[PDB]
Design an enzyme around this catalytic site. Structure first.
Site, PDB file in Angstrom:
ATOM      1  N   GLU A   1     -13.795   0.802  -0.382  1.00 59.71           N
ATOM      2  CA  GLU A   1     -12.472   0.372  -0.932  1.00 59.71           C
ATOM      3  C   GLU A   1     -12.431  -0.611  -2.072  1.00 59.71           C
ATOM      4  O   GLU A   1     -11.400  -0.528  -2.744  1.00 59.71           O
ATOM      5  CB  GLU A   1     -12.339  -0.848   0.378  1.00 59.71           C
ATOM      6  CG  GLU A   1     -12.626  -0.021   1.708  1.00 59.71           C
ATOM      7  CD  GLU A   1     -12.068  -0.788   2.943  1.00 59.71           C
ATOM      8  OE1 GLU A   1     -11.897  -2.261   2.871  1.00 59.71           O
ATOM      9  OE2 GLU A   1     -12.054  -0.530   4.215  1.00 59.71           O
TER      10      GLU A   1
ATOM     11  N   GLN B   1       5.493  -8.512   1.564  1.00 58.86           N
ATOM     12  CA  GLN B   1       4.611  -8.261   0.591  1.00 58.86           C
ATOM     13  C   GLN B   1       5.345  -7.486  -0.460  1.00 58.86           C
ATOM     14  O   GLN B   1       6.610  -7.236  -0.467  1.00 58.86           O
ATOM     15  CB  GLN B   1       3.687  -6.972   1.003  1.00 58.86           C
ATOM     16  CG  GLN B   1       2.223  -7.321   1.491  1.00 58.86           C
ATOM     17  CD  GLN B   1       1.245  -6.150   1.929  1.00 58.86           C
ATOM     18  OE1 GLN B   1       1.936  -5.060   2.345  1.00 58.86           O
ATOM     19  NE2 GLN B   1      -0.031  -6.468   2.052  1.00 58.86           N
TER      20      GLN B   1
ATOM     21  N   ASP C   1       1.024  -1.208   0.040  1.00 59.25           N
ATOM     22  CA  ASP C   1      -0.020   0.095  -0.013  1.00 59.25           C
ATOM     23  C   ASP C   1       0.972   1.467   0.017  1.00 59.25           C
ATOM     24  O   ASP C   1       0.677   2.278  -0.666  1.00 59.25           O
ATOM     25  CB  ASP C   1      -0.943  -0.045   1.254  1.00 59.25           C
ATOM     26  CG  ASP C   1      -1.755  -1.219   1.299  1.00 59.25           C
ATOM     27  OD1 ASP C   1      -1.365  -2.308   1.283  1.00 59.25           O
ATOM     28  OD2 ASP C   1      -2.924  -1.071   1.038  1.00 59.25           O
TER      29      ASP C   1
ATOM     30  N   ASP D   1      -4.731 -11.704  -1.487  1.00 58.85           N
ATOM     31  CA  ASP D   1      -5.766 -12.310  -0.526  1.00 58.85           C
ATOM     32  C   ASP D   1      -7.294 -12.046  -0.700  1.00 58.85           C
ATOM     33  O   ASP D   1      -7.298 -10.624  -0.209  1.00 58.85           O
ATOM     34  CB  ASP D   1      -5.373 -12.482   0.846  1.00 58.85           C
ATOM     35  CG  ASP D   1      -5.290 -11.240   1.701  1.00 58.85           C
ATOM     36  OD1 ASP D   1      -4.229 -10.380   1.380  1.00 58.85           O
ATOM     37  OD2 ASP D   1      -6.021 -11.265   2.516  1.00 58.85           O
TER      38      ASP D   1
ATOM     39  N   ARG E   1       5.932 -12.607   7.733  1.00 55.28           N
ATOM     40  CA  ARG E   1       5.431 -12.224   6.402  1.00 55.28           C
ATOM     41  C   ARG E   1       5.935 -11.102   5.657  1.00 55.28           C
ATOM     42  O   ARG E   1       6.811 -10.321   6.399  1.00 55.28           O
ATOM     43  CB  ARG E   1       3.923 -12.190   6.283  1.00 55.28           C
ATOM     44  CG  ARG E   1       3.253 -12.487   5.254  1.00 55.28           C
ATOM     45  CD  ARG E   1       2.034 -13.367   5.462  1.00 55.28           C
ATOM     46  NE  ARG E   1       0.852 -13.003   6.039  1.00 55.28           N
ATOM     47  CZ  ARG E   1       0.457 -12.846   7.117  1.00 55.28           C
ATOM     48  NH1 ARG E   1       1.231 -13.830   8.087  1.00 55.28           N
ATOM     49  NH2 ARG E   1      -0.566 -12.187   7.868  1.00 55.28           N
TER      50      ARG E   1
HETATM   51  O1  LIG Z   1      -5.196  -2.863   2.912  1.00 53.21           O
HETATM   52  C1  LIG Z   1      -3.959  -3.542   3.238  1.00 53.21           C
HETATM   53  C2  LIG Z   1      -3.695  -4.848   2.999  1.00 53.21           C
HETATM   54  O2  LIG Z   1      -5.165  -5.560   3.418  1.00 53.21           O
HETATM   55  C3  LIG Z   1      -5.548  -6.930   3.046  1.00 53.21           C
HETATM   56  O3  LIG Z   1      -4.852  -7.560   3.616  1.00 53.21           O
HETATM   57  C4  LIG Z   1      -4.482  -7.614   4.893  1.00 53.21           C
HETATM   58  O4  LIG Z   1      -5.720  -7.962   5.747  1.00 53.21           O
HETATM   59  C5  LIG Z   1      -5.884  -9.422   6.080  1.00 53.21           C
HETATM   60  C6  LIG Z   1      -6.788  -9.745   6.996  1.00 53.21           C
HETATM   61  O5  LIG Z   1      -7.847 -10.125   6.800  1.00 53.21           O
HETATM   62  C7  LIG Z   1      -4.542 -10.051   6.235  1.00 53.21           C
HETATM   63  O6  LIG Z   1      -4.305 -11.580   6.672  1.00 53.21           O
HETATM   64  C8  LIG Z   1      -3.414  -9.669   5.264  1.00 53.21           C
HETATM   65  O7  LIG Z   1      -2.224 -10.219   5.700  1.00 53.21           O
HETATM   66  C9  LIG Z   1      -3.326  -8.311   5.090  1.00 53.21           C
HETATM   67  O8  LIG Z   1      -2.397  -8.189   4.229  1.00 53.21           O
HETATM   68  C10 LIG Z   1      -5.526  -6.645   1.468  1.00 53.21           C
HETATM   69  O9  LIG Z   1      -5.670  -8.062   0.810  1.00 53.21           O
HETATM   70  C11 LIG Z   1      -3.995  -6.252   0.982  1.00 53.21           C
HETATM   71  O10 LIG Z   1      -4.144  -6.167  -0.434  1.00 53.21           O
HETATM   72  C12 LIG Z   1      -3.973  -4.864   1.596  1.00 53.21           C
HETATM   73  O11 LIG Z   1      -2.481  -4.705   1.067  1.00 53.21           O
END
Ligand SMILES: OC[C@H]1O[C@H](O[C@H]2O[C@H](CO)[C@@H](O)[C@H](O)[C@H]2O)[C@H](O)[C@@H](O)[C@@H]1O
EC number: 3.2.1.28
Length: 548
Positions: free
Chosen positions: A487, A178, A131, A299, A176
């Site tokens: 979102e 990203q 992000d 995810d 973890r």
């Molecule tokens: O918006 C920031 C990120 O949020 C999501 O992912 C997060 O939220 C999950 C909780 O359900 C976590 O398991 C995950 O590890 C976090 O990264 C979203 O999928 C991401 O794309 C965003 O970067």
């Protein structure tokens, strides 16, 4: 004019609402975590590395001022084990980040205060990895650079002390990561600060590339992530157990068959699994793929769930190509084309890096590119086969600059029409596919990277079109939902029956997109003119500017 109204909110109220800075009084406001409900999450907590005694004093003393918060400060082990993070699962906490040294000019007394950063907003109170590139782009257009620089300072700190760029800075993310943008994220902040003219800028550039080089070697090109045969990297976090931050119900459906196989209740099966007592290989792998999907930021999507651990994605390997190119440039200029990693004492030259990227570009084309369909697919390194799923991330090849001109146009002609919807780019084609990151959902990062990617390869009329489609959809929602910024967006459909902060990379997608719009198009956006009507209304030569 709703376009100017939304823009004005994004530049001022929104970013401020999302901005965080650690002082002594606001801790526990910054440490608030709703995502994990458990008895250890009632009191705020911060974890600090063993290297930072001064930071330990800062937060410890913070607890001493406002005992009302009942804040707990705890050091971290010099070696952070997957087993160790599983132990703090039920006792979570926020991780310390970069701190800014501020000295009293008269008396010299040094006080520590955090560097600024932006949270995605809402449930997510922390600095997130991918992000933050998106947001930093938007913050530099809003001419708040200190907020963008702070995150770069944070990624540097994250890499040194925590060993990688974290999904977010919290106990349960320590294994973890990203998708890495740090190199390009460093360049855009370097140029904004004045480039080589600013000595602080050059200092920052070096420290960020020093850290970027280490992240490359020790994380993405290291094992388990690196596949030795293909030489391509995969998302392979070392996390252990069931991730705490999800819903208590989230995994119950896949777990229940295993509990019945083991003849115990599920809530007991959960605890005995997190105690390491049950050994189920097939389930151990599932949660491995789960953590890989969360490391990809996608995810959840169907091209990943049950699939991506072994998968070498167009995503990650494209951003690595950008890393290799950016690193090469850095060494040739500032390092006099000789760089010796102070950690392993490894000497490298730009020619070597520029080589490494050439091999990556070759191997990506080998195992991924499909000239008939026009897409870059992902290669499974376990079963040694290519995926059939058509994803919007294929445009990252453009963003990185690893595609040949021949590949690009074949991709624009053949691949783009299947991903281009009313609201811009769907995350994947309908055929390839209700998951989250799949069709019919467009996402801001997918748009942002494709805009700049398409621009680099010479098609900015396609970017103007795709930006219009996106900004129109966002504008109509702003007026129809009465200032609510959402979102997620369905790019194939219209509108429906706290948004004061918006959502970070959606905010940024809006401004970044508006740069591509001339004043005629901005006015048409204010009227909420759909793309079909706007385009058909233009003189034929002006319509060329949108690729039509
Ligand atoms: O918006 C920031 C990120 O949020 C999501 O992912 C997060 O939220 C999950 C909780 O359900 C976590 O398991 C995950 O590890 C976090 O990264 C979203 O999928 C991401 O794309 C965003 O970067």
């Amino acid at each position: 004019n709703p376009v100017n109204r939304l823009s004005r909110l994004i530049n001022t109220q929104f970013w401020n609402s999302l901005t965080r800075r650690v002082d002594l009084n606001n801790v526990g406001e910054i440490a608030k975590d709703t995502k994990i409900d458990t008895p250890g999450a009632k009191n705020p907590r911060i974890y600090v590395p063993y290297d930072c005694p001064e930071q330990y004093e800062f937060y410890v003393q913070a607890s001493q001022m406002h005992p009302s918060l009942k804040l707990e400060v705890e050091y971290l082990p010099k070696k952070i084990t997957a087993e160790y993070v599983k132990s703090v699962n039920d006792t979570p906490g926020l991780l310390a980040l970069a701190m800014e040294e501020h000295f009293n000019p008269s008396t010299g007394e040094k006080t520590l205060i955090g560097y600024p950063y932006a949270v995605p907003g809402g449930r997510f109170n922390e600095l997130y990895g991918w992000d933050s590139y998106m947001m930093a782009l938007g913050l530099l257009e809003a001419n708040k650079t200190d907020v963008a620089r702070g995150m770069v300072e944070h990624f540097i700190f994250e890499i040194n002390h925590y060993g990688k760029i974290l999904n977010a800075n919290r106990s349960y993310y320590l294994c973890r990561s990203q998708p890495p943008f740090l190199t390009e994220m460093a360049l855009v902040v370097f140029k904004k600060l004045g480039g080589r003219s600013n000595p602080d800028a050059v200092d920052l550039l070096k420290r960020a590339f020093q850290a970027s080089i280490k992240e490359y070697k020790t994380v993405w090109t290291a094992s388990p992530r690196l596949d030795p045969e293909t030489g391509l990297s995969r998302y392979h976090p070392n996390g252990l157990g069931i991730p705490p931050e999800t819903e208590s119900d989230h995994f119950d459906t896949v777990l229940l068959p295993y509990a019945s196989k083991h003849g115990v209740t599920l809530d007991e099966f959960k605890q005995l699994y997190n105690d390491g007592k049950i050994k189920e290989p097939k389930l151990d792998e599932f949660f491995l793929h789960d953590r890989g999907v969360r490391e990809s930021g996608h995810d959840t999507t169907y091209r990943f769930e049950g699939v991506c651990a072994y998968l070498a994605t167009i995503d990650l390997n494209s951003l690595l190509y950008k890393y290799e190119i950016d690193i090469a440039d850095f060494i040739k200029e500032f390092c006099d084309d000789k760089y010796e990693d102070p950690l392993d004492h490894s000497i490298t030259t730009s020619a070597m890096w520029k080589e490494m990227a050439k091999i990556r570009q070759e191997k990506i084309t080998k195992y991924m590119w499909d000239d008939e369909s026009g897409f870059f697919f992902d290669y499974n390194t376990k079963i040694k086969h290519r995926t059939s799923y058509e994803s919007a991330t294929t445009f990252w090849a453009l963003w990185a600059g690893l595609a040949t001109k021949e590949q690009a146009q074949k991709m624009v002609e053949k691949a783009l029409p299947k991903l281009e919807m009313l609201g811009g780019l769907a995350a994947c084609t309908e055929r390839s596919r209700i998951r989250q990151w799949d069709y019919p959902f467009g996402w801001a990062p997918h748009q942002i990277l494709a805009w700049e990617g398409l621009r680099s390869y010479g098609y900015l009329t396609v970017t103007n079109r795709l930006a219009y489609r996106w900004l129109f959809m966002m504008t109509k929602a702003f007026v129809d939902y009465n200032g609510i910024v959402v979102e997620k967006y369905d790019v194939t459909r219209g509108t429906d029956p706290a948004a004061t902060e918006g959502f970070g990379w959606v905010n940024a997608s809006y401004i970044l997109g508006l740069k591509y719009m001339n004043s005629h198009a901005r006015r048409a956006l204010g009227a909420c003119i759909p793309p079909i009507s706007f385009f058909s209304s233009l003189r034929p030569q002006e319509r060329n500017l949108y690729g039509l």
